[PDB]
Amino acid sequence: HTLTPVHEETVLSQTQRHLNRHNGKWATEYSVSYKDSFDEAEVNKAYSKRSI
Amino acid sequence: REIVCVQAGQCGNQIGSKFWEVISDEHGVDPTGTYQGDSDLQLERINVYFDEATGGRYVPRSVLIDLEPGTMDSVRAGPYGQIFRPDNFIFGQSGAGNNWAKGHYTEGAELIDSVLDVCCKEAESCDCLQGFQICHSLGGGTGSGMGTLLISKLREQYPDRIMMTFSIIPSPKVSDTVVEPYNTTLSVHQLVENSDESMCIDNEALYDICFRTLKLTTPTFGDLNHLVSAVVSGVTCCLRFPGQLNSDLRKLAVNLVPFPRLHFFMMGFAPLTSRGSQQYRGLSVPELTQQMFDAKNMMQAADPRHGRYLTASALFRGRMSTKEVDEQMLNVQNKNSSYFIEWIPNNIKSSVCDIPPKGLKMAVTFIGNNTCIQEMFRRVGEQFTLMFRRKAFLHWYTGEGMDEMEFTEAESNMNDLVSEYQQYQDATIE
Amino acid sequence: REIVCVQAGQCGNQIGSKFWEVISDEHGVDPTGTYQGDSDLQLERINVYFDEATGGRYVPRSVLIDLEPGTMDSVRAGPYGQIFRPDNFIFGQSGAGNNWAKGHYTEGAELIDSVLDVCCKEAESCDCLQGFQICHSLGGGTGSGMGTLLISKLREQYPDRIMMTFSIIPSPKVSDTVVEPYNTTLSVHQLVENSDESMCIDNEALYDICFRTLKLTTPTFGDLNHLVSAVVSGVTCCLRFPGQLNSDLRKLAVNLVPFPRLHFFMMGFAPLTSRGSQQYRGLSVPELTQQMFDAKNMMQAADPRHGRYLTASALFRGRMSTKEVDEQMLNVQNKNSSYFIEWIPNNIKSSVCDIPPKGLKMAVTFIGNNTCIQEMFRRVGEQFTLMFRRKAFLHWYTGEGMDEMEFTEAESNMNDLVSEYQQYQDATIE
Amino acid sequence: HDKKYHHCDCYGHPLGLPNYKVLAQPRTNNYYNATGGCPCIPRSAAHPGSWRNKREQLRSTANHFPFGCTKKRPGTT
Amino acid sequence: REAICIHIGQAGCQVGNACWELFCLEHGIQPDGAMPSDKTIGVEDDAFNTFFSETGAGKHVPRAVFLDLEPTVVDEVRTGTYRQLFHPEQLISGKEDAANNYARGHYTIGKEIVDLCLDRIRKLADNCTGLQGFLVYHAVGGGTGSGLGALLLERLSVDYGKKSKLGYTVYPSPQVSTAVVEPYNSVLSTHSLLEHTDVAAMLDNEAIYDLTRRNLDIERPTYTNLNRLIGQVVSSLTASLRFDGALNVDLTEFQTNLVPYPRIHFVLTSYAPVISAEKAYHEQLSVSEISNAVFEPASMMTKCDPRHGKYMACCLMYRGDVVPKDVNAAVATIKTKRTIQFVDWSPTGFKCGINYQPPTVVPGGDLAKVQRAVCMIANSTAIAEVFARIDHKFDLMYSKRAFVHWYVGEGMEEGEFSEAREDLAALEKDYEEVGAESADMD
Amino acid sequence: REAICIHIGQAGCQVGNACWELFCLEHGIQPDGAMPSDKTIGVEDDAFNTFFSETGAGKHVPRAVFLDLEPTVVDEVRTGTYRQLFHPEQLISGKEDAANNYARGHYTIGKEIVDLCLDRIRKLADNCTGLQGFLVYHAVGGGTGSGLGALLLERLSVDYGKKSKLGYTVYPSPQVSTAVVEPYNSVLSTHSLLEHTDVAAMLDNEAIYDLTRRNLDIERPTYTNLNRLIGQVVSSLTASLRFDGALNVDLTEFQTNLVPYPRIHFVLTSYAPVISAEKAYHEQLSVSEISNAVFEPASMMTKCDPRHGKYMACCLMYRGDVVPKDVNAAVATIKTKRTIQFVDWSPTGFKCGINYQPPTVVPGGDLAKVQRAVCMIANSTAIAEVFARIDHKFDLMYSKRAFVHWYVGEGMEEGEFSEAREDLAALEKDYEEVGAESADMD
């Protein structure tokens, strides 16, 4: 049950299909509201410590 | 959560062809049956109406019934006709004769076993079965008699599921058939016991929609059946796409039907507007709500202004705010307060779905439970009593085998339905 | 574990030709007898049906018997006819005349010793002998009389092995010959004593299969014999290929017959569907199970819905999960519990084999023991009683030498078989 | 019950712990001879995992305690 | 210091998405469950533990279950962005909804799904070493939220016993409405919430809509905004467990200070610096201004006016750069006001908390960034007015048996309507009696 | 040290393929038994000796016999991948099956084949120096497994005497079924097995199907998955002989600790970290979690619920990275539970084992990789419910003598049906009597 390059192309096509959903006509509000925005928010850790 | 469809008679098969065109278009199914869509959102609920055949293809979970195959050959010959499974076409060898008794008792009992076998085969294949959906006219012959026969058999076999019908009823001004009152009265008698929810459409109302609102120069049955297929496909949209406030046929029934006999509803669809005017006004929730409650946009001859709303439901499709829905339904209830039954504190249910029909920014479908439905039944009962007192055409039905007692029972039951609507019309808090 | 086949009369020899075509194709044997296959799985059980002669060749373990050489000319003209061993063809010089007594008493006793000599020569060559397989019609003359004679002799010589028959019985609707009921009654008397397991086929059921399911425009007896050859070659498949849950003719017999007279079985083969429809349905285990239990796909005129299942067996060919098989058999047993005899706690045996028939991804054959088989015998007894009360054609049989008491004895035995089935149908726990 | 308020019983959900002594008793043929019978699983016509299946296959779903306020109900327990 | 969150039905799962988005972003766990280390030398810190547990490889996973009868919203979560954060067994979904019937949820359908939920809740509680309550989010207007929420709270109350259960509940708004059968479900939801909860905070969407129109500058808000506000409130209330501060407040202190009698546990909630980014740079935001804000009726998240009643207890949570002396001066100024009245049997009306961690700012959010905030939960007799309007709408419908055949068909006795309505009537009389001055001396 | 394995019929040979695959890969013997061309010995150490013996040239051969009446399965073994591992004499095959008849296996055909099997087993037992039992794998539902397994166990019990015989037995599932005549064969098997087995472990395919659906993520399981799970269980129980550990457990200790009275020898089996690869990285897997897991009925490989009975003895085998203090704390917590009950005459209910070798990973397998596992075999009165249902189905069929003529034709007196049915009735009464409290009898 190994994979030929044709199977690799099919797998890559399925990944692209999953990524390209929720386009302009098919946008839900979870898609446009909840996204990945970790790199834009500031994180403060001054007032938190390790319990003993 | 999958529905099984039944299409009966000429009207039913014709409406069905346009419905399955609309459904195949929204989900991107080629007229060969091949999936050619462009988003996973189309695929992820395809099971609701389609079964999957091998290497791509989808097949529609529908039964086609008629007494002469001429119509079946016409539907098989249509542009999307190939999609239908050949084994799903069931036909006899002689017509209903436009007679209810023939359709119910003689050719009905001859065909019904093969239809029940196919419907059970289709139902038991489902992992969880939602209601059945049936399209037929009450004025015809095979539609009324065999449709109500099949409804009774399915109600015996699946009493815990939902039974839903869309039904065409004779216009108040011009008849298409002389014996319409008998077929209509007997069919309404069968439906009020058997059905869970029944929607009614007048062809006269679709003509008035086309001429007044759309200003069409040369309408055809394709336009009327397209309007109907649009509303039909709109009612199920929340079943099969995500939204902020999901809805279901059972939730509609629970909010619309106060008492089990009061299950006959009016229909409308809002963003109807002529191609010349469309450049002058953008879509927004006030515009849809105003057209939605305008009696010009309602698909029955009875007018709401002669009755009162017990309950109503609005299903919205599109990317939209909750403020406009909640505040519009409150504002409409407050300004027109005399037209709403006062012993229910809020008559309207709302639901919101993200995915509109292609090429419209927004749409709403409206379902209304209004006491003005009593005028249609009263008119049919008057014409029936005029015909029955004189034995006007009765020998055909009695020669098929019907007892005269059926006509008096059906008349009495329909008259009691009219009385019950009138009593709820004039109720008060005291 | 070798099977010996016997083909008797026109129907038997014709069905045999198609059977040996299917078996020779599955093992990759050329019509010259040369092996041309492409996998060891074909070779490792070839001994089961073929003996190997020197320098490549394989020969099929079958005896052909008939009273007129017409059939030999018909089998010789077929595409595979050359494969058969010349010494295995036994024929006379004049016909059975459609008369049971002639076929049983005059030319039967004349030829039968040479047939027993050939069958013994074939049996004693096996290292271990499995049951015999016999094809014949019950309505004919030499088929009924000489087939049952030979069956009785083989039952005398090998009482601990299995005796299996495939048998064609006269339709209530279409007949080619007037004296079918006498020959049928005498043959059923012989079978119920001699046989271990008997399958019954109505030509009417094969015509209805061809016309409704396959929609063949111009079916021929070759199509009917192809359906029969398909099931015949399917029942033995687990004997001769690997699988996850092996099965054997003796295990089928042990699970199907509760009491030794109750050895009459129903037949089915699941993947049947018209060339137009084939584009519409992917293969799966639920689809095979659904077709397998549909009475439309059963090869007898009696319908299971008029009886109850004592026991049933399903043999699956193909690469599939055991969970799906077990859970399907559980669901069918639970949902239809009224059609299963209640004093047996589980009625269905399953078996799974890895190697499907060529060109099919999966297949199942179904064997069923149902009391509604009593209805066929009752119809034959009715037609017998109509003719016998008036001595309608008896002088032919009496001129051969039969005592009239023989006809009443055979009638009594069939009536007792019908009574025994009816009593077990209506038995109860108390 | 107490004044101006209803107890869990009134609504039909007593909340006492089970009788573990009876729970730990195996269900043999003598048990079914004494009460009821047929240790076989009841057959059902509904799909597995549907409320009808659980209703006519399991004891917990089919159980129904008496409903009603203790003042009007005799109680007898 | 652990807490387990239970989310029920549509509102509860959608509010859960906003809550867990916020708690991830506030602690710093990435959507894949890994925390990116900042310093190479030093201890890892441990603050997530109230809401997350770590595996030995350092992945984080959250202490929550998501419960629904329809698949679509939970399947959307399964296919969304946070797929890898949740354990897949935790996301439990049935086949078909309770169809706005409390009876269908309680009797027919919830009984099938409830045992998986109980096994997951048990598996969580076994993985704890300090547990101080269950947080439950649901709406009482819909069928599965009412019926399965009641059934599950009953089972939890038998199995877990003394452990505390704090509910956030979306009650039917006083004139905005979404379904016809809301009064029946809310009435039946009552006993479940009366005897099977320790404090229940009630919210109405019409108030949060008013707050988002008036204070923020949003013309067309949608549920994601309301859910983000609710998440902010929950984060403010649970911050006292998770970060350093001057005056900590354990969840048992709420019950001790807020509840005078065991049935009188329904509380009002409000939040002060709801302000837009353009206004935020024009104004200072001192302690006394936000303390004055939480007492104005424009700030509340429930549609009731407390000037029509009397306060019994107040709990004030300050987070950020605040000094206790300023809190004391503010509370003394509030006490001076003539339009704020306390029942004469409650002289020491206030509980205070002070935490150093300022509120977090969410990238897509609509709130401004501010250095300090205050959050209030308060018990007041004004709440009795909400029940009177529910009872009037129930009486109007029930006088003609408008829908009862659905409920009787799905398994419920007709008697249950009258019993529940009498229990809520007694609750109304309790709130009338507790607020009456002791003018009679014997 | 050494143990000899006997595989009977279809299930026993197919489970044998998975077992010997695992034991080869765990010890390191190649599938053909040879060694690389430059080495002088294939492996450095003798630990294999429990299951394999090496020739003086260093080829390995395994201590097993395969017994079948039909050739096909053994011919598959002869032509498969392990062709060179087995000695050809060990693979014994007859001409024709026992046709689902216990009578055909026991009287007619197994009586003919049994002396070859005994001669092969003797030839194995002569090449041993510390044999400490026989392991037997068979199903009691089929004809040759039941009839020849019973006959062979009887002969073994006479010839070898005191040596222990431990059975792994596949019993007919309570509603999944494969053949009509299963009750007769299972009753007659259990009748023979009562006298002539020291401990019998019972397995049902319906439980392993449930386990593979819930814990593993397999939509379409087949017998190879079940057989790999069984092989893992056997490897866990026999690991105590083969690798270093803190608390070893010899095969003779099981019979001494688990069996209170000579008829009460049927035990339930369960295995804890049956888990899929996607779940395994979402969860820690500590000792206390898997100890809590082994007592839940979702973990069991037999379809019985132990909450409906009382435990008499439990034997807990831990393998991998476990520390004794955690095992003791876990067992004391289990002992605390209220749904776990011991008979009052059995105060010291537990036997423990602790082994350092973690479970092996098989290239095609479906289990995740884990550092520790625990396996339990336990004796409980709940087992009486399985026999009652088999006996009721037997009574239903036997009231009409539904199939008896086959059994009488293959050599059995009709009296044997009634005798076996009274013995199983007496076994039911034994399970009623043993479970009666001593405080109740005074």
Ligand SMILES: Nc1nc2c(ncn2[C@@H]2O[C@H](COP(=O)(O)OP(=O)(O)OP(=O)(O)O)[C@@H](O)[C@H]2O)c(=O)[nH]1
């Ligand atoms: N704040 C807020 N309220 C919501 C949200 N979703 C629904 N509601 C409200 O809650 C009530 C509807 O309850 P639902 O959660 O839809 O009911 P349900 O739990 O799905 O019950 P079923 O319909 O039987 O499945 C209405 O008053 C809605 O306005 C939400 O996401 N946020």
Ligand SMILES: Nc1nc2c(ncn2[C@@H]2O[C@H](COP(=O)(O)OP(=O)(O)OP(=O)(O)O)[C@@H](O)[C@H]2O)c(=O)[nH]1
């Ligand atoms: N777990 C498991 N069960 C099996 C396996 N193979 C067969 N079974 C079960 O065991 C029973 C059938 O027993 P068999 O082994 O086929 O009987 P047999 O030993 O071949 O006896 P004969 O049919 O007379 O040859 C059924 O319940 C099967 O489900 C297997 O590989 N694994």
Ligand SMILES: Nc1nc2c(ncn2[C@@H]2O[C@H](COP(=O)(O)OP(=O)(O)O)[C@@H](O)[C@H]2O)c(=O)[nH]1
């Ligand atoms: N809207 C619509 N109405 C139709 C169509 N075809 C027929 N009808 C109406 O249905 C009624 C005739 O019923 P019919 O279908 O002929 O009954 P049947 O003979 O039993 O099949 C008349 O009122 C027609 O106007 C159609 O395609 N669309």
Ligand SMILES: Nc1nc2c(ncn2[C@@H]2O[C@H](COP(=O)(O)OP(=O)(O)O)[C@@H](O)[C@H]2O)c(=O)[nH]1
């Ligand atoms: N299905 C099938 N039926 C056949 C075939 N040949 C003959 N029959 C039927 O069998 C009956 C004639 O019997 P026949 O075989 O000629 O009897 P015989 O003269 O004793 O061999 C008629 O009903 C024929 O229709 C055949 O090849 N297939």
Ligand SMILES: [Mg+2]
């Ligand atoms: Mg919902």
Ligand SMILES: [Mg+2]
């Ligand atoms: Mg076998």
Ligand SMILES: [Zn+2]
């Ligand atoms: Zn309660």
Ligand SMILES: [Zn+2]
């Ligand atoms: Zn039973």
Ligand SMILES: [Zn+2]
């Ligand atoms: Zn009470």
